[PDB]
Amino acid sequence: SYIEEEDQRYWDEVAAVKNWWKDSRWRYTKRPFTAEQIVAKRGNLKIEYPSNVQAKKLWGILERNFKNKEASFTYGCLDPTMVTQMAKYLDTVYVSGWQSSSTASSTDEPSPDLADYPMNTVPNKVNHLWMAQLFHDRKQREERMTTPKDQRHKVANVDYLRPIIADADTGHGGLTAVMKLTKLFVERGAAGIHIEDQAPGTKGKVLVPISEHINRLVAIRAQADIMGTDLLAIARTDSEAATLITSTIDHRDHPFIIGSTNPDIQPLNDLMVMAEQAGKNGAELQAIEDEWLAKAGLKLFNDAVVDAINNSPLPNKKAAIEKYLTQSKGKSNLEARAIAKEIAGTDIYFDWEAPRTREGYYRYQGGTQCAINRAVAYAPFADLIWMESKLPDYKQAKEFADGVHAVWPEQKLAYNLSPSFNWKKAMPRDEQETYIKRLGALGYAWQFITLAGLHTTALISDTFAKAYAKQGMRAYGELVQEPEMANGVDVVTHQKWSGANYVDNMLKMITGG
Amino acid sequence: SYIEEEDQRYWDEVAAVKNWWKDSRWRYTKRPFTAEQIVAKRGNLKIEYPSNVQAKKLWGILERNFKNKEASFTYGCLDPTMVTQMAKYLDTVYVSGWQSSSTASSTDEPSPDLADYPMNTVPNKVNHLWMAQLFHDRKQREERMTTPKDQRHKVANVDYLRPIIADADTGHGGLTAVMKLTKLFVERGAAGIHIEDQAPGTKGKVLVPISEHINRLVAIRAQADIMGTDLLAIARTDSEAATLITSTIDHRDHPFIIGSTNPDIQPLNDLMVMAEQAGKNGAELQAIEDEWLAKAGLKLFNDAVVDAINNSPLPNKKAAIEKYLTQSKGKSNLEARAIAKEIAGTDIYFDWEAPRTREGYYRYQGGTQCAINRAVAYAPFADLIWMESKLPDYKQAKEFADGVHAVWPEQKLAYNLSPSFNWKKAMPRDEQETYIKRLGALGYAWQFITLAGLHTTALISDTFAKAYAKQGMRAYGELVQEPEMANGVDVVTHQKWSGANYVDNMLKMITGG
Amino acid sequence: SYIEEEDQRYWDEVAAVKNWWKDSRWRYTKRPFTAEQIVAKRGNLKIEYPSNVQAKKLWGILERNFKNKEASFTYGCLDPTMVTQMAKYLDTVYVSGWQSSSTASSTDEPSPDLADYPMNTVPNKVNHLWMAQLFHDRKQREERMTTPKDQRHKVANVDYLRPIIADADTGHGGLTAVMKLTKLFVERGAAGIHIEDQAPGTKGKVLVPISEHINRLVAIRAQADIMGTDLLAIARTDSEAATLITSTIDHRDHPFIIGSTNPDIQPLNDLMVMAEQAGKNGAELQAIEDEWLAKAGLKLFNDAVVDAINNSPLPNKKAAIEKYLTQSKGKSNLEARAIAKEIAGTDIYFDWEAPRTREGYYRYQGGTQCAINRAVAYAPFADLIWMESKLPDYKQAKEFADGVHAVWPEQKLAYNLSPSFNWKKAMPRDEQETYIKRLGALGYAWQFITLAGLHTTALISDTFAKAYAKQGMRAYGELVQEPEMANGVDVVTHQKWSGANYVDNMLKMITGG
């Protein structure tokens, strides 16, 4: 009988996933799998994750911004003391892998920004702040509740539960790794996570095929789905600086890979290789590489093929170029290669493997075009898109926005505010106070200053410890105290803030009796 | 043959512990056990802990101060970014259990200052900073070494390896727990640790017998000894605020326990107890306790016994009191009780159990006298002594210093600088800049501002996030940037500081070839 | 408006705790606090813990046993491979602190049975198995679901979700520590936890006042209540072997503390103390202690007072003794002391402090009487009671059962099966096969063989590694293989069991498309 009992259950569990899938949340999400399959990877005990609740907040806050064409910003929170003041003012909290690389490795061994730290490192950072959020919410709700309704109106009401967003890196591995990383993240109170299109352990960026990454975002959703959570996926793309790619394999990456056009020169490897056999220090090598590249004349086929026309006694160029250009939109290389000849008449030479690196990587042409190119593909399996940008440039930002909005006019985008750019000496005050407001009107719903915490911190510690070493207790008072009091910092009141009355009344509660 | 082989080994290992025990380090340390026994708890594989090296630094720096009658200060470091700037200026690093209670629980569940967090919590904080110290020492030593000797003179030479001192709490348990906690601490790069005389899990302080704690310090040394490290033990004492004690048991705690002198009133328990049976909310209870205590007339025997004299038609009081006072110095209660009568003629009434608490604790009289009393006992099995002080008071500090220096003129003391006291509005600028210098001349070799990090942090985050929420990118630049640059903060240079060139050259090293 | 909004919420949250408190689960639980207070320690985000679901299973299975007067047993599971086979046959899983002390310390430093390891050690053991339970439930449910209903009837249906019970030790600290430990435990899938009446860090057992421990059980319930879970509390008691107690303080512990009756001998301390000052190695001390105790004539007042009668030319003893005996049932010592005289006529001498230990502990009289004495008190704030027993003794077990059943006829008890007793050579086969069945009829609903895993393991590894070192690959096959196959062990099929098809179909699910 269990069988008939058992199956119905499966079947009703299914009809529940799907009905869910009907949500306004999913209006833009494309699922390449079925409830039937999702529901089959599920066990007999349904666990409800509380981060889900947070995710529903984000969705909520991110969807008002777009419509209102406004943004919400934040910055990388380093610690609980921090997550604490931030809440008074900002509505999200961001967790950076750069920061955690420098202050939070589960193995406690620090490093420059590389995801050579263990997977859980960031998830763990999320738990770190999530737990304290819930904790400072109990402290406060206690305090309020043990206060005369007629007098609460005066008590604080800081919203400590501000949804968190975390750096998911590359996915820290393969398709399965990605899913584990997701679960971890959905276990420690993450409202949303983000993944890049870089190749794992390559740090001139080395990108990955479009398909592969479309595969991550999907695996990220398959999990969320099993765990039944509305997690926000966020797709970042490293094109605007990328210089390499791992495989010719993706049809859509062809217009962007650099081949060689000197059929008279050796492919690099053997040359480099030989030099390795037969001397050539380190440099020589680099030397020999620098020349070898300045000779090989590299371009993007489409360019090659165009060059070709322009040097042919062929008449009516434009008509030509166009045809080629026009006809070939979206086709494979092997293809374009065909149209080429038919058009031009000869066989343009093009070799995109003689340029490959020591590790066998391909020359790739990064850039806004590259960015929007992937972005647009990513767009269906992602909540927001982020074209990580080297410098705060409004035009680049408008193009990109604009570039993406053509295919998908309802896309939400996120932007990372330059911590390196010299904001004060590189743009007028007005241009500074509104920079975010502005991008926001382009549909940049979420923004953040990645390394803001590391800095605010570093700054203050150098200042203090310095004076301190100079004036002793005077500095504390001057630099530290008056301001604290003067500004009304929570923390000012030591113990209370720690959660003293809370514990207090607690024992009185038990001890009571 | 192994046997004869085996034994000699033991015996030579012994002669090595002892010879070590000869060190100038141990000139003031009293070992109630033998190399023979220490060396028996050791295994066949000798592990050399690198924290030992740090401890030898402290010893070194702490012993110059005393002789020079100067001090070194610090404050509670919260994180690696922090341990980083601090080093430029301060020569030690301190790790507080109050801070870690609020930002670093191995279980990630925060709390007010109680050691209800797991044992490793702080040890782990030590590893946290220790690892990064070694790391920023490699980064820097690399950089220097790959620089023309003729030009290093310009490169930085920050000493990142500044010895760490950690809050060991109570010992987080019993005698064995104490030893485990020690090992953990000696495993993660601790130069010195400190233990208090409070009872574990009682938070009006509840103290512990003098003997018990003399037992911790000893267990702390037994371990250090097995692990063969020069760890610095630091004994703190909670007398100046203590109000309870766990057992009449220690002979030396008698002069300090409060008994009752109203043979006409019930002991509290039953009364409280009954009230528990027969109604009396919560208050009543407290009420009934407040009265019961204001009636029972409590004092310290010696006082009682003195009172007694003063109300006797007995002539020649002073002669009397004195005798009693004089004769009894150091004796047990049961004893004094004897002298009493013989002297006075009656049986003074004194009951130190009718006042005991719900949990069976004894009324105890905290205070400087109490402090120096224990301190002086602790003095033989400890490196420094710390009479944790509520308020920055120079007279209290001189007495205590002075109080301890009588028995032991060569004692090193540590002092905790008040984070709560309103330094700026409570003492003249001169009185502020020298406060430490001064205590230092009393032999307060190590000083620190316990909750300095939490604050410097909190402060800065409220300030930033606030403006930020107001002026966007303008704030970063204004509050954050210019200063950073303006002041020359390490961190300013993002990546370099992360350890980028280091990793860089590393791969070039391998990849090299 | 929020205020009026805010308050109602509190008030409806309250009416929900209480209504819950109405459950058949709580029919025997006594709450010395209010929903009003519980609900005030709660935050604004309700987290539903999935262990709760497990607890509802236990309740369920434990309440059928009692009524049916049957039992369910288990033993200490060491690992996930283990939790795995156990499920095929047993219906609960137990986690021992003795085992985890020897194989699972969060700091990885092993030790004999002492809770000197960090708090989370066991909670963590629970997560360890809980996670894998859910995991082997997904693997299996997948497999079944991707199988023709007409053919599932053949597929396995092992219930991997068997409720877990964990050793909570003493509470690893004070009242707050207890609550943290509880939360941890309720976070990692614990169905029930157990706490003892020993004093933390004393390992001849050193007990704790009845009140203190009644305080733990309560704190354990206060938490469960906030976290809103039906956790099962289980009170263990160390009387039958106890030899000490920390404070005279509990009224009900009086009938059990041993005082002295030789008004002519010194209290121990000073004597021991002196000997410490003035020589007396280690032994002497022990010597001097052994004599000092054999002279001091110790008994339990009530005995003393009785002795007294029997040596009085007082006529009509029985009438006397009785009166005393009868009248005094339940009274304090100070009290009994009163009745005494009035009855007898003299002042019986009795001093229960001259016997106290070096650490100030009291002589206490362990034993079944002691056991039932506490048990009966614990009974109101606990789910099951466990009088930890040295040896499998049915009479002791019937008395105890019986002893407890008088006050509370509906009490559930747990019993720990002796791993040390020589079962095979100490009792007839019949007496062995039914031992559990039998206790079960006394109302011993849950039973377990504490160190069963450690053993089954140890056994097998010595056997294998031995032969192995002797016959190489032959042993594997002989000792290991055939049996595995011969018996049909899950694990036999390597990968499948690992969760291979599960992952497989997973990628096919994504990769699919």
CB contact under 8 A, A137 and C45: yes
**Best of C131, C151, C186, C509 to disrupt the A interface by mutation (most A CBs within 10 Å)?**
C509
Both tokens assigned to A291: 């020349």
Burial of A360 (0-12, 13-18, 19+ CB in 10 A): exposed
Whole-angstrom Cα distance, residue B365 to residue B373?
12
- Which residues have C-beta within 8 Å of that of residue B461, sequence separation ≥ 6? A81, A82, A84, A85, A86, A453, A456
Q: Regarding beta strands B72-75 and B444-449, do their DSSP bridges make them parallel or antiparallel, or are they unpaired?
A: parallel
Whole-angstrom Cα distance, residue B234 to residue A283?
56
Q: Regarding beta strands A298-299 and A257-260, do their DSSP bridges make them parallel or antiparallel, or are they unpaired?
A: antiparallel
Q: Which residue has the tokens 């202690």?
A: C289
Nearest by CB to C247, which of B114, B270, B360? B360
**How far A225 CA sits from the closest chain C CA (Å)?**
12
Residue of B463, B467, B413 whose CA lies nearest to B443: B413
Residue of C381, C355, C360, C239 whose CA lies nearest to C301: C355
Burial of C411 (0-12, 13-18, 19+ CB in 10 A): buried
Whole-angstrom Cα distance, residue B467 to residue B474?
9
DSSP sequence for A72-96: EEEEB--SHHHHHHHHHH-S-EEE-
Both tokens assigned to A232: 């926000």
- Contact in structure between C17 and C225 (CB atoms under 8 Å): yes
- Contact in structure between A262 and A295 (CB atoms under 8 Å): yes
Whole-angstrom Cα distance, residue C128 to residue A106?
18
- Contact in structure between B127 and B189 (CB atoms under 8 Å): yes
- List of chain B residues whose C-beta atoms are within 8 Å of the C-beta of residue C251: 269-270, 273
Whole-angstrom Cα distance, residue B391 to residue B383?
24
Whole-angstrom Cα distance, residue A119 to residue A171?
9
| B420 belongs to an annotated ligand binding site | yes
- Rg of chain C on CA atoms, in Å: 28
Whole-angstrom Cα distance, residue B477 to residue A450?
14
Among chain B residues, the shortest Cα distance to A457 is held by B457
The backbone region for B177, taken as left when phi is positive above 0, alpha when psi lies in -120 to 50, beta otherwise, is: alpha
- List of chain A residues whose C-beta atoms are within 8 Å of the C-beta of residue B490: 458, 462
Sign of CA dihedral B218, B223, B225, B230: negative
Both tokens assigned to A239: 């094109």
- Other CB atoms within a 10 A radius of the CB of residue C203 amount to 16
Helices within C379-451 (DSSP H only): 394-407, 429-433, 435-441
Q: Where in chain C is the domain with CATH 1.10.10.850?
A: 248-356
**φ and ψ at residue C403, rounded to 5 degrees:** -55, -45
- Rg of chain A on CA atoms, in Å: 28
Q: Which residue has the tokens 């009364």?
A: B271
Residue of B24, B62, B81, B20 whose CA lies nearest to B163: B62
Sign of CA dihedral C263, C264, C268, C274: positive
Gaps in chain C after residue (C–N beyond 2.5 Å): 203
Whole-angstrom Cα distance, residue C252 to residue C335?
12
Both tokens assigned to B439: 């205590």
Q: What type of residue sits at position A263?
A: P
Segment holding A369, helix H or strand E: helix A368-378
**How far C114 CA sits from the closest chain B CA (Å)?**
8
Chain B: touching chains (3 or more CB pairs < 8 Å): A, C
Burial state string for C444-467 with b = 16 or more CB within 10 A and e = fewer than 16: bbbbbbbbbbbbeeeeeeeeeeeb
Whole-angstrom Cα distance, residue B302 to residue A427?
78
Segment holding A56, helix H or strand E: helix A51-68
Planar angle of CA B86, B454, A461, nearest 5 degrees: 30
- Contact in structure between C185 and B336 (CB atoms under 8 Å): no
Q: What type of residue sits at position A34?
A: T
Whole-angstrom Cα distance, residue B175 to residue B185?
16
Both tokens assigned to A248: 């010719």
Is C118 in a helix, a strand, or coil? coil
Whole-angstrom Cα distance, residue C433 to residue B37?
48
- List of chain A residues whose C-beta atoms are within 8 Å of the C-beta of residue B137: none
- Cα–Cα distances in Å, from A135 out to A49, A141, C139, C224? 17, 10, 35, 17
Q: Regarding beta strands C298-299 and C257-260, do their DSSP bridges make them parallel or antiparallel, or are they unpaired?
A: antiparallel
Nearest by CB to C141, which of A42, A138, A145? A42
DSSP sequence for A400-414: HHHHHHHH-TT-EEE
| C298 belongs to an annotated ligand binding site | no
DSSP sequence for B381-423: S-SEEE---SS--HHHHHHHHHHHHHH-TT-EEEEE--SSS-G
Whole-angstrom Cα distance, residue A168 to residue A193?
6
What percentage of chain A's residues is helix, strand, coil (to nearest 5)? 55, 10, 35
DSSP sequence for C289-308: HHHHHHHS-EE-SHHHHHHH
**How far A95 CA sits from the closest chain C CA (Å)?**
21
Both tokens assigned to B133: 């110290």
Whole-angstrom Cα distance, residue C436 to residue C413?
13
Among chain C residues, the shortest Cα distance to A149 is held by C3
Q: Which residue has the tokens 């066990």?
A: A43
Residue of A192, A138, A97 whose CA lies nearest to A412: A192
DSSP sequence for A132-168: HHHHHHHHHHHHHHSS-HHHHTTS--------EEEE-
Whole-angstrom Cα distance, residue C460 to residue C452?
12
Burial state string for A308-337 with b = 16 or more CB within 10 A and e = fewer than 16: bbeeeeeeeeeebbeebbeebeeeebeebb
Residue of C106, C167, C162 whose CA lies nearest to C137: C162
Sign of CA dihedral C255, C256, C261, C267: negative
Residue of A83, A167, A85 whose CA lies nearest to A132: A83
Both tokens assigned to B322: 């004195």
Strands (E), B208-302: 232-236, 242-245, 257-260, 298-299
CB contact under 8 A, B174 and C202: yes
- Contact in structure between C188 and C126 (CB atoms under 8 Å): yes
Segment holding A273, helix H or strand E: helix A268-277
Whole-angstrom Cα distance, residue A193 to residue A180?
13
- Contact in structure between C170 and C115 (CB atoms under 8 Å): yes
**How far A493 CA sits from the closest chain C CA (Å)?**
21
Among chain B residues, the shortest Cα distance to A83 is held by B461
| A174 belongs to an annotated ligand binding site | no
Planar angle of CA A201, A203, A209, nearest 5 degrees: 65
Longest dimension (CA), chain C: 103
Q: Which residue has the tokens 């070493």?
A: A469
CB contact under 8 A, C3 and A175: no
Q: What type of residue sits at position B115?
A: A
B1-247+357-513: CATH, from 3.90.1150.10, 3.30.70.1400, 3.20.20.60, 3.30.460.80:
3.20.20.60
DSSP sequence for C123-155: HHHHHHHHHHHHHHHHHHHHHHHSS-HHHHTTS
| B236 belongs to an annotated ligand binding site | yes
Nearest by CB to B116, which of C106, C176, C359? C176
Among chain A residues, the shortest Cα distance to B203 is held by A504
Q: What type of residue sits at position B493?
A: T
Both tokens assigned to B96: 């507080």
Looking at residue A265, what DSSP letter applies?
Answer: S
Whole-angstrom Cα distance, residue A355 to residue A359?
11
Whole-angstrom Cα distance, residue A441 to residue A316?
44
- Which residues have C-beta within 8 Å of that of residue C171, sequence separation ≥ 6? C177, C178, C181, C195, C200, C216, C219, C220
Q: Where in chain C is the domain with CATH 3.20.20.60?
A: 1-247+357-513
Whole-angstrom Cα distance, residue A190 to residue A168?
11
**φ and ψ at residue B336, rounded to 5 degrees:** -30, -50
Sheet with strand A362-364: strands edge to edge = A205-207, A242-245, A362-364, A257-260, A298-299
- List of chain C residues whose C-beta atoms are within 8 Å of the C-beta of residue A179: 506
CATH dotted code for B248-356: 1.10.10.850
Is B289 in a helix, a strand, or coil? helix
CB contact under 8 A, B512 and A282: yes
Q: Which residue has the tokens 């439930």?
A: C137
- Contact in structure between A106 and A188 (CB atoms under 8 Å): no
Looking at residue A117, what DSSP letter applies?
Answer: S
**Best of A113, A114, A281, A461 to disrupt the B interface by mutation (most B CBs within 10 Å)?**
A461
- Which residues have C-beta within 8 Å of that of residue C406, sequence separation ≥ 6? none
**How far C219 CA sits from the closest chain A CA (Å)?**
6
Whole-angstrom Cα distance, residue A176 to residue A7?
28
Gaps in chain A after residue (C–N beyond 2.5 Å): 203
Whole-angstrom Cα distance, residue B390 to residue C410?
54
